[PDB]
Design a protein around this ligand. Structure first.
Ligand SMILES: [Mg+2]
Ligand SMILES: [Mg+2]
Ligand SMILES: [Mg+2]
Ligand SMILES: [Mg+2]
Ligand SMILES: [Mg+2]
Ligand SMILES: [Mg+2]
Ligand SMILES: [Mg+2]
Ligand SMILES: [Mg+2]
Ligand SMILES: [Mg+2]
Ligand SMILES: [Mg+2]
Ligand SMILES: [Mg+2]
Ligand SMILES: [Mg+2]
Ligand SMILES: [Mg+2]
Ligand SMILES: [Mg+2]
Ligand SMILES: [Mg+2]
Ligand SMILES: [Mg+2]
Ligand SMILES: [Mg+2]
Ligand SMILES: [Mg+2]
Ligand SMILES: [Mg+2]
Ligand SMILES: [Mg+2]
Ligand SMILES: [Mg+2]
Ligand SMILES: [Mg+2]
Ligand SMILES: [Zn+2]
Lengths: 178, 77, 134, 177, 57, 119
RNA sequence: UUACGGCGGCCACAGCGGCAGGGAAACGCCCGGUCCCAUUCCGAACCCGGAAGCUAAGCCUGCCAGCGCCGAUGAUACUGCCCCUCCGGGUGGAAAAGUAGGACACCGCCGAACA
RNA sequence: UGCCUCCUAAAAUGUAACGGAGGCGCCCAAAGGUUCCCUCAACCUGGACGGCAAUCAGGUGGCGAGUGUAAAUGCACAAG
RNA sequence: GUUGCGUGGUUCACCGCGGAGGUAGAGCUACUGGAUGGCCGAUGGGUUACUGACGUCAGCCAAACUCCGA
């Protein structure tokens, strides 16, 4: 039982009915999945995303990612079709709540010169995306066993209908917004 | 004078189309519709063929129909 | 007037039979020239009729050309025998059937408008007439 | 006001429509509220005059073999070259329904400055009771600068008459030159 | 596919220099992750030229 | 919705195998409809659309069978394997319904292959 | 007889959208991953074991012509044959478009509640 | 100059010109067989590098994508 | 074409019934292109009188356009 989940159904599940007046408890929003990907565009050249993007997202998240191939060739990017350019992991269930708790507690303040995340980065339904800029945010990877530094952007897909409904959920979980 | 050096050629006409019309009595094995693609689809007692050739599997009578937008050829034994 | 692309550079002739079933009333303006017989109206003939209407009213008013020359006609080189390919396209032509409104005009004076259109009909290879908005 | 004497057609077709026109008559139909359509002749010049006055809407009183019937003119088929009525669509009315009618917009005003006045639509389709049907509804220009353009919205239409065309039909546009 | 391809993943204790301690499931070998700053002790989590001339004189 | 996705996707799979499998008078079609609690089965004869035999888990004989949901799939597999033989049927074609062959549906199918039906 | 669950015919007059209401058994979301089985990563899905919760959604029912769809009668275009120098005419067929309108489907077998 | 596809070609088939447009003399051990599963392009919103457009997430989208290769006839049930 | 030997109404015409079409015509916010006048206005240009995309409102065209269709 991950501790961000038992904290979710204790007071977060009940505080949302009093802010947004739902009739039924099957309308209370909940985060369904957290998707992290790298997007290693500098792997069309030199073809080294093996130790780079695969072996650190296994250490950050806990399971081995999927490698995403390119769908159409773009000449200016020197990109050919069917060439690995992206590395993606998808987190459900207990490994999701154990990622979001580990992200907001000990990782999201390790951003250099951190003054909060924007609360306007919702797409229109209540799904939040923000981008990390380095791997040293996480202790689970080390600076001395890695290749070149690379960032990642993290989707948090919720059951929310609109944005401020999804903003009130992630505020109650512990996302820091400015 | 110039020339039509770029034109002047054609392939042979392939004799495509309906070979047995509606209500017409056929034998087993008779070719009903010769076509490119499925302009017509098989029905009951009709098979497609290797180059979409819609023959007869059973002696009977040819009847045309509709089956969810597609037009089909069937045999009533 | 000339198209900027055609899909087919060499075409058959448009067919001069029938009565016009579309474009047979005055839509845009007040006065209109209506065709009474079949002809091929080239783009050189339309521009001679546009400058003939515009130089008789000289300012004030609005001229509509609801006819475009997008059908090409071909021509062999000059002193040639018959038949070693189709000739290169030379003319641009609109197919004009009886009933088809060709030009439309708005002008405040009825006399000058009806006289500016008469000068256009003497620039066209058709018998035509002037009609109004019923 | 419009006494129009009709007679029921005997035989119908391509041949009988031509023979009725050589007698100066106009073929037409009368279809209305859920009835079978009537096939009937028109006296021609007496029908051509009654729409030459009174507009084209012009509520008609018919004489269908001794029987009286009120009819609006739904559609006309004009020959493109002879400019003569070939066929008429007449629909019955009863003393006020919300039937739909296009009616001409006449334009008033003076383009004082360097302004040309252009009109795009000639008639708006309003809905009104089936015996009033105003002759035309006007529009005016107060000396409009090249600019502000008048629309089907902000037209002057009386009581009972409702705009159901579109409230954005540009009826008059004013420009430079 | 959910067998011996994924990295090892078991229970892991996290402590901060502030005095925070809680218990998650992570990939650190031994389960002894130690942070210098966390969600409890970080800033942002708890928090004129006319006066320049006046200060000189 | 996840149920709106699941209904459309399983009847798209069920139309996918319907292109190659019909069911006739001599050889009816054993259609299974599997839910989270019960399973249903019937023999449909797709020439006039007339069911000739049916069985389910909601009737009181299968309702009082002990065990998991696979033990109640064998019992309903036994019932249509005799209501068909009472109706004069000894060969059928098996219809997945759009589900995967295996688990509870294969246990219905193995109870029907032992008690007389010959697919 | 059902504001029931299936399987078909049928493939928009049947769709798409809007607004309401529905939960006996059933259909579902749902709660879990020990066992069969599963993810180019993920028990999301597929599969299995369950019945704490709920009609919010699907599904069903009713109402809306809104966007789509169907669409005459008459007339015209075109046309077979014939007469006729053209023009046109006689006889036999006859659109597309638009209009009057229609339409928020209908039918069959099995199961359940009721008969 | 042989073969293949379209228009001419006059709603079966067939139809000429030194008439109007194009392709072929290959390629694939999978791009064959079967079994099962999936739905596209485009547009919109959000997102470290990252741009009109790489990878991601949510919408919308009944086929405008795709099909080894010309074109026609087909194929969303998929033949993708 | 004719003639010998066979076969016999199987040929042909009209009436009725069952069938497949994509020509004439017509239509195009049903596709691919061409294209007139407006309105809106991407961006380009010289700070905004010029270009005026995509859309939308009317009227049109096509052997190699077709939702239709004799
Ligand atoms: Mg050919
Ligand atoms: Mg072959
Ligand atoms: Mg037209
Ligand atoms: Mg119940
Ligand atoms: Mg689960
Ligand atoms: Mg509800
Ligand atoms: Mg008719
Ligand atoms: Mg029609
Ligand atoms: Mg022919
Ligand atoms: Mg032919
Ligand atoms: Mg060649
Ligand atoms: Mg293979
Ligand atoms: Mg090939
Ligand atoms: Mg395939
Ligand atoms: Mg006959
Ligand atoms: Mg017939
Ligand atoms: Mg026919
Ligand atoms: Mg064609
Ligand atoms: Mg034509
Ligand atoms: Mg166009
Ligand atoms: Mg424009
Ligand atoms: Mg055509
Ligand atoms: Zn601390």
């Amino acid at each position: 039982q991950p501790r961000l989940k038992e904290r979710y159904r204790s007071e977060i599940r009940d505080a949302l009915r009093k802010q947004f007046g739902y009739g039924n408890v099957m309308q209370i929003p909940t985060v369904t999945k957290v998707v992290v990907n790298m997007g290693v565009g500098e792997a069309a050249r030199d073809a080294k995303l093996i130790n780079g993007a695969v072996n650190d997202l296994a250490l950050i998240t806990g399971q081995k990612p999927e490698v995403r191939r390119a769908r159409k060739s773009i000449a200016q990017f020197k990109l050919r079709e069917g060439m690995p350019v992206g590395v993606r992991v998808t987190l459900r269930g207990d490994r999701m709540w154990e990622f979001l708790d580990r992200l907001t507690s000990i990782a999201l303040p390790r951003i250099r010169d951190f003054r909060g995340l924007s609360p306007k980065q919702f797409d229109g339904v209540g799904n939040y995306t923000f981008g990390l800029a380095e791997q040293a945010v996480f202790h689970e990877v080390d600076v001395d066993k890695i290749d070149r530094v690379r960032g990642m952007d993290i989707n948090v897909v919720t059951s929310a209908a609109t944005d401020d409904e999804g903003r009130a959920l992630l505020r109650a979980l512990g996302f820091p917004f400015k | 004078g110039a020339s039509s050096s770029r034109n002047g050629r054609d392939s042979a006409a392939q004799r495509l189309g309906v070979k047995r019309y509606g209500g017409q009595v056929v034998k087993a094995g008779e070719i009903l519709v010769r076509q490119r693609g499925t302009k017509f689809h098989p029905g009951v007692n009709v098979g497609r063929g290797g180059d979409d050739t819609l023959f007869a599997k059973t002696a009977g009578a040819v009847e045309f129909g509709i089956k969810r937008g597609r037009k089909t050829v069937s045999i009533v034994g | 007037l000339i198209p900027r692309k055609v899909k087919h550079r060499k075409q058959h002739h448009p067919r001069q039979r029938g009565i016009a079933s579309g474009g047979t009333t005055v839509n845009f303006g007040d006065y209109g020239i209506q065709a009474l017989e079949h002809a091929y109206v080239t783009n050189r003939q339309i521009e001679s009729a546009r400058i003939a209407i515009n130089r008789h009213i000289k300012r004030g008013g609005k001229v509509w050309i609801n006819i475009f020359p997008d059908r090409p006609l071909t021509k062999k080189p000059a002193e040639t025998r018959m038949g070693s390919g189709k000739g290169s396209p030379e003319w641009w032509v609109a197919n004009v059937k009886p009933g088809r409104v060709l030009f439309e005009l708005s002008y405040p004076n009825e006399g000058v408008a009806r006289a500016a259109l008469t000068r256009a009909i003497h620039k066209l290879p058709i018998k035509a007439r002037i009609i109004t908005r019923e | 006001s419009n006494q129009l004497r009709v007679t029921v057609r005997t035989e119908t077709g391509k041949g009988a429509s031509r023979r009725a026109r050589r007698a100066g008559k106009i073929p037409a139909v009368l279809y209305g509220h859920g009835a079978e359509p009537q096939h009937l002749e028109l006296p021609g010049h007496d029908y051509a005059a009654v729409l030459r006055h009174s507009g084209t809407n012009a509520v008609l009183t018919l004489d269908i073999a001794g029987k009286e019937q009120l009819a609006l003119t739904k559609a006309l088929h004009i020959h493109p070259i002879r400019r003569t009525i070939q066929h008429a669509d007449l629909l019955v009315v009863r003393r006020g329904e919300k039937v739909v009618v296009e009616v001409s917009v006449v334009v008033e005003g003076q383009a004082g400055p360097d302004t040309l006045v252009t009109q795009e639509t000639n008639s708006i389709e309003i809905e009104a009771e089936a015996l009033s049907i105003p002759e035309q509804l006007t529009v005016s220009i107060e000396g409009a600068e090249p600019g502000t353009q008048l629309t089907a919205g902000q037209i002057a239409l009386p009581a009972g008459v409702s705009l159901i065309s579109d409230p954005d039909l540009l009826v008059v546009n004013v420009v430079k030159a | 596919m959910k067998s011996d391809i994924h990295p090892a993943y078991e229970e892991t204790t996290v402590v901060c220099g502030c005095g925070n301690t809680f218990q998650t499931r992570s990939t650190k070998p031994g389960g002894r992750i130690v942070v210098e700053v966390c969600s409890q002790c970080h800033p942002f989590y708890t928090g004129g030229r006319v006066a320049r001339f006046e200060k000189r004189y | 919705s996840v149920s709106a996705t699941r209904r459309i996707s399983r009847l798209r799979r069920h139309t996918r195998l319907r292109k190659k499998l019909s069911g006739t008078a001599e050889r009816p079609r054993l259609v299974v409809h599997r839910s989270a609690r019960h399973i249903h089965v019937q023999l449909v004869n797709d020439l006039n659309g007339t069911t000739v035999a049916a069985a389910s888990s909601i009737e009181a004989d299968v309702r009082g069978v002990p065990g998991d949901k696979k033990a109640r799939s064998v019992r309903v597999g036994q019932l249509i394997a005799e209501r068909a033989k009472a109706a004069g049927i000894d060969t059928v074609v098996f219809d997945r319904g759009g589900y995967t062959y295996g688990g509870r549906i294969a246990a219905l199918a193995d109870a029907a292959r032992e008690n007389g039906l010959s697919f």
